[PDB]
Amino acid sequence: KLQFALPHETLYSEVTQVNLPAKSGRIGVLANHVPTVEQLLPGVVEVMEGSNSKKFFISGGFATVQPDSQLCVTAIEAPLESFSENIKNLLAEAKKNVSSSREAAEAAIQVEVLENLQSV
Amino acid sequence: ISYAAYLNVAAQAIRSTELQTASVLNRSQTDAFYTQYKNASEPTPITK
Amino acid sequence: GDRQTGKTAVALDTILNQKRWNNGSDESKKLYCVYVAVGQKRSTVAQLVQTLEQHDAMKYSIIVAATASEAAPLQYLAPFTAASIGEWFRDNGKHALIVYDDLSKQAVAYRQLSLLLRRPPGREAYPGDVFYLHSRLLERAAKLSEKEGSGSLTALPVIETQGGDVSAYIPTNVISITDGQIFLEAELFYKGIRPAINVGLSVSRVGSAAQVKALKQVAGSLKLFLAQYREVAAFAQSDLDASTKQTLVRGER
Amino acid sequence: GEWFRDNGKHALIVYDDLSKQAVAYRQLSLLLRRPPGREAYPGDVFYLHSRLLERAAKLSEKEGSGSLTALPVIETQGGDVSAYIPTNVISITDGQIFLEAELFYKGIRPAINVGLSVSRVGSAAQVKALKQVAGSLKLFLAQYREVAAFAQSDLDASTKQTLVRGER
Amino acid sequence: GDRQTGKTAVALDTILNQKRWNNGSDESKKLYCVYVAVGQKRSTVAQLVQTLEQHDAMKYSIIVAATASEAAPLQYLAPFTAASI
Amino acid sequence: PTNVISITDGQIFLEAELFYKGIRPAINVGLSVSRVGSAAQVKALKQVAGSLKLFLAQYREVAAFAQFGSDLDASTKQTLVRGERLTQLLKQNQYSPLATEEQVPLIYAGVNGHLDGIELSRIGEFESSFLSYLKSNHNELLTEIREKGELSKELLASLKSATESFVAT
Amino acid sequence: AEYFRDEEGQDVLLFIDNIFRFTQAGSEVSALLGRIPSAVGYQPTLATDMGLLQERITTTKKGSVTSVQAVYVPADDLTDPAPATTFAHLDATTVLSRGISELGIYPAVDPLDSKSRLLD
Amino acid sequence: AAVVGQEHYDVASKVQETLQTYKSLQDIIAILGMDELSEQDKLTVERARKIQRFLSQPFAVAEVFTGIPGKLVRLKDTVASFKAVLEGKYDNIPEHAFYMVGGIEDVVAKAEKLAA
Amino acid sequence: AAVVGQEHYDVASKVQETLQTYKSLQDIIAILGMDELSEQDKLTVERARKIQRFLSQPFAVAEVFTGIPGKLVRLKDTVASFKAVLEGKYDNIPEHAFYMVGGIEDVVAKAEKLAA
Amino acid sequence: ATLKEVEMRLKSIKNIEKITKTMKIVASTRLSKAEKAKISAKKMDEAEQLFYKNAETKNKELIVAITSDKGLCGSIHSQLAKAVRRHLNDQPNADIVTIGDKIKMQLLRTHPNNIKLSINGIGKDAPTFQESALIADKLLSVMKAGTYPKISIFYNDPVSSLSFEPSEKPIFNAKTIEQSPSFGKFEIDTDANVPRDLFEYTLANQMLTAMAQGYAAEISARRNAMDNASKNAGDMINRYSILYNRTRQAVITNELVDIITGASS
């Protein structure tokens, strides 16, 4: 079972195969899995129910396989196609931001986010 | 930069494509003033 | 109390109750009651007469009647004439009672008489001697002394407040004369408490050595308690503690 | 007016203002020492106004089909419509148009307060054409009045639709 | 002002404060004072003369009084005859 | 009452509610007028009390707003705080008028905001003490205020300094 | 009405239009006759005069007149002397309302306003 | 002042002022909730509710009519009693305690009665 | 409108409406606050408050009742000066510079005075 | 007069009724959106809580509290103040961070040593992640959140559709997460500091929920309060209406008598 809930939505809140991108690379959960807690990095996420696959762009969060086979995914915001050009313009602004100043870290996250979006 | 701040900036970036609803844009708007206090005494209030 | 809170009924029941001692053989138990009906329709009075004969009560009571139809000078003189009828009982020592329904209407009668005599209008346009009018009538109710024969004449006069406001020239003047008031409240009457005897504004300035000792002992402090229920539910409409709740539960029952 | 009514023309006589007519009757009566009455207005003052205002009529087809519309104007002192001279007249008349000072100030001139005016002969009048396309108008304005005070935030789309239509 | 808001006291203070100039020798700065009391009871008036004597201000005051025991004409005549004073 | 009001040249309207409320002499400032006005005010006292009327008028409005329990911005709370001090300044112990020469300082203190700091409860104490202080130290100031009856620039500055000295207490 | 009741036996029902305007009319006749005006402005002979009109309508042992009268409260006060004097005579009130007719229901009788004396 | 004595006058001044505040806030109390009062005022109102009830005095001659036994409290005691109540010393016990009881000491005793 | 000329009429009509709206809003502002008055309403309150105090003008005989020298504006000048205010051409000026001033030129002058 | 002073006062009372009506309706409108937000928030919270429960995480001291800037929303402001006071007795030395003007004012009165950090401007909007995150970030930096051996958040749980009961819950410390009774096959990362990161993550995730619960309780209370206001105002209309009616009658009579007196002479 998968429970995917966000502070403004409830998505998948069983689910056949789920692929999640975590600070440990990528983790896939199918049935029982070891009941770890792993922090989700800014991500492209796929959730598959049967063979049907739905693709989510996930802002990072935390993932926890519960020892009862409940995949708790919580993250700040997301479908993938909806996120998708103007942001590519925005990264140019963000590059400028790296130059001036906390803003560096912010802009670094922005570089990660454009890169991740360009990746898909 | 706290862990949740790290996620926060990422979320803000994600609201950038332009097809997005007003409520999304509203969730990115904020308005607050963290007013520090001590002892009674109040060090000045400043926006988040 | 307020207009057509069926005021008459509260008194009517009093007349009815005096039958289970008034049909006796003890002459220190008779309370022959005179009902003075002033300013009520000939229909209304006639219905009352029939009501009394239905409860087989007519035989112990006299009715003096000065109906709505009857001309204004008769109405003015109507309570006074009735009170004379009452006094014969009083001065024989036989305990009696007289209920004058409604003296508020006697005032309206005196108003007409006075204005037509061109006597200058008074406060609230009522006669200037209106205080005197009520006072001479009312003060003839008495409990004669042992010397004078031990008679009585319990008088209960029924005043119809307009708008249910206890201040107002005709009501206040009567309130001042009488010993105690038994105010009836429109809100309670409407909200299914009949008899609708508000206990906030009913006092009896006449002692508690009126009611028999049994009904003094059992009824001890219940007047206080139900003016604690009154207080409790006044501010019930915040956080009710068990003390308030216990009182509220008692009060409601 | 009677010549017009009797001869079978139509005519409208607008008595302006009956409030001052009243004052004149008061002056005569009190000076003639005839008994005073309510609010120091002459005793039969209801009777006087009623006589004047009922001469207006709409004659039958037997009687030549004349008319004599009338429109008395009454000045309400401080808008107190409980006052004795206004109250009497309000009863006598068969309709009211209630011009409100606030509306006048608020730039609505003519300042007819839509709520507090009534027509008691109503739909007999109104050109048939104008009746058809303005039955709606009465109803729309009614909603606008009710939803008026809600114009002080986060308002339903329905409420907002009313407000736009109503203000316009 | 409304009855029994010690209205008299507001005025009585004025009379008392006129002590400061009065005592002095600058003739055209003296304000002598005439307090006219119409309609007050004899005891009230008497209390006033006592207060004024206590504060030693009854040495530059004339009190024209017509207490409410006195006749209706005398009361009517009382302000106007004070005015003459 | 109506007839007399027309005839007379001023009203020094008193109010019952304010008598109980703590003011005494209870003079409702809003309903009192002096139509012959400040042509008869002591010249000095006119200068010191110049905005006193305005402040009090502002106080009435602000205080009304405050009782609805509405949130108050800082400008409103300046008025409210200042206003409170004025009300206590007015009060006086009956049957003991205070010399005008020693009323010019007290009003100066209030209007020039020196009592804004002083705690509400002890405004009366401050008033009593201030008079004592002026008698002791600034007895030169008092003689001048009486004598010249209009405050000069120099006197105003002297007075300003004097009041400040007593704000320390 | 009384001729019908007394000499033809049938119960009959005699309507009066505004009975307020009966009172109002009476108020004028008093004032013209020169009697001192009485409380709130109505006749000095207010009570008895209402009595003469409202006690001839009664249930006789032959027939009965019954009267449905229309009361127009002055200044919408039920405390005014003219409505009050009227209210004493009334036995039931059927309170036709415009709200009720607007709810489609016709007869327009308001179900929770009407009250009767005989209804005990 | 100083006719009834300075101390008496001070007690009385405060009693009047407190009660007047309570009367002043009567509008607000009905229209809005009793807790929507300002915090400073809310203390005043609570104090005053006590002062008002405290004013009672079980009549000693109408004891027959009234029911409650009679109470007559000395003047010297009265000034003392109210002084304390204004200073909040005894203000911590139920409001009902203040109603229909004699001197300050009696209020305390009535707290014990209520507590039982 | 004909009598006073169309320009005069329009300017004055706009003043009347603006002030009247403010009067209507006064009740809402009193209890609720300005915390639910719209952006348009906030602008109306600000303009109205400025217009409201623009009315005051020191008088020549109020130099002994005030002491600010009297001011007499021309008819043409009054129409113009109010017109500007309504248009919001001087909605950048602080409120106290409308108190006891002459025309628009004076409002500008008092803005400078406050600036110092 | 009597008549005019009565009449104006009744007009005031009428206007008060109109305002209380208006507010009450608008409050209801606002409430629907508020509830919608709170549902979503609560759903999210349960997922985070799922870890804490299954882990059975079992916890100076920090106290955090939530109320709006806005007042006149019934007794939300003062019931929470009362429950803060109750647990302020318990730990004398705790540092209270007040999110909201109303809790700031009340708390400041009861002990004026408490206030160390406070916010202002949160109350006028729906809960939003952005707000929670920023408050959280500042909470870590300014207050050095990790130091406290207990963190506790106080809020008003909107218990039932007509009630709100002030409630608190403990945000688990980073130490707590580390030593958690079952920190069994929870975790695998020994590299990434999953306790020190998860602490931070739940600092905000918990705070957002608390803020959301609060916002709903607040708007719900305001609706309830303004409803009771309308009722109370209605009662005052009726009472002053009777007074008005009497006063009106009295003026007519009193005036009439004066005219009569003149004619009679």
Description:
The structure is cut from a larger assembly and holds 1 copy of chain A (120 residues), 1 copy of chain B (48 residues), 4 copies of chain C, 3 copies of chain G and 1 copy of chain J (265 residues). With 48 residues, chain B is α+β, with helices and mostly antiparallel strands. Chain B has 2 helices and 2 strands, in the order H-H-E-E. Chain B has a single domain, classed as ATP synthase, F1 complex, epsilon  subunit superfamily, mitochondrial (Atp Synthase Epsilon Chain, Chain: I, Orthogonal Bundle). Chain B has a two-stranded antiparallel sheet with strand order 1-2. Chain C has one domain (1-211): Rossmann fold (3-Layer(aba) Sandwich). In chain C, 42% of the residues lie in helices and 14% in strands. In chain C, the strands form 2 sheets. In chain C, strands 2-1-3-4 form a 4-stranded parallel β-sheet, sandwiched between helices. In chain C, strands 5-6 form a two-stranded antiparallel sheet. Chain G has 120 residues and is an alpha+beta fold. The interface between B and J is medium-sized, with 26 and 31 residues.
Strand-and-helix sequence of chain G, N→C? HEHHEHEHE
Radius of gyration of chain G: 17 Å
Termini Cα gap of chain A: 27 Å
Major sheet of chain G: size, sense and barrel closure? 2 strands, parallel
Number of domains of chain A: 2
CATH architecture of the largest domain in chain A: Sandwich
Number of strands of chain A: 9
- Oligomerization: part of a larger assembly
Instruction: Calculate Rg of chain A over CA atoms.
Output: 16 Å
Number of helices of chain A: 3
PDB class: hydrolase
Keywords: Hydrolase, Nanomotor, Complex
Entry title: Yeast ATP synthase State 1catalytic(a) without exogenous ATP backbone model
Chain A: ATP synthase subunit delta
What is the fold's blueprint, element by element?
This is part of a larger assembly, with one copy of chain A (120 residues), one copy of chain B (48 residues), four copies of chain C, three copies of chain G and one copy of chain J (265 residues).
Chain A: E1 2-6, E2 9-10, E3 17-22, E4 25-29, E5 37-40, E6 43-49, E7 52-58, E8 61-66, E9 70-75, H1 80-83, H2 86-100, H3 103-119
Chain B: H1 3-14, H2 22-28, E1 33-36, E2 45-47
Antiparallel strand pairs in B: 1-2
Chain C: H1 7-17, E1 32-38, H2 42-54, E2 61-66, H3 72-76, H4 78-90, E3 96-101, H5 103-116, H6 130-138, E4 154-158, H7 169-177, E5 181-184, H8 186-190, E6 197-203, H9 214-217, H10 222-225, H11 229-236, H12 242-252
Helix pairs in contact in C: 6-7, 11-12
Organism (chain G): Saccharomyces cerevisiae (strain ATCC 204508 / S288c)
Subunit structure (chain G): F-type ATPases have 2 components, CF(1) - the catalytic core - and CF(0) - the membrane proton channel. CF(1) has five subunits: alpha(3), beta(3), gamma(1), delta(1), epsilon(1). CF(0) has three main subunits: a, b and c.
Family (chain G): Belongs to the ATPase alpha/beta chains family.
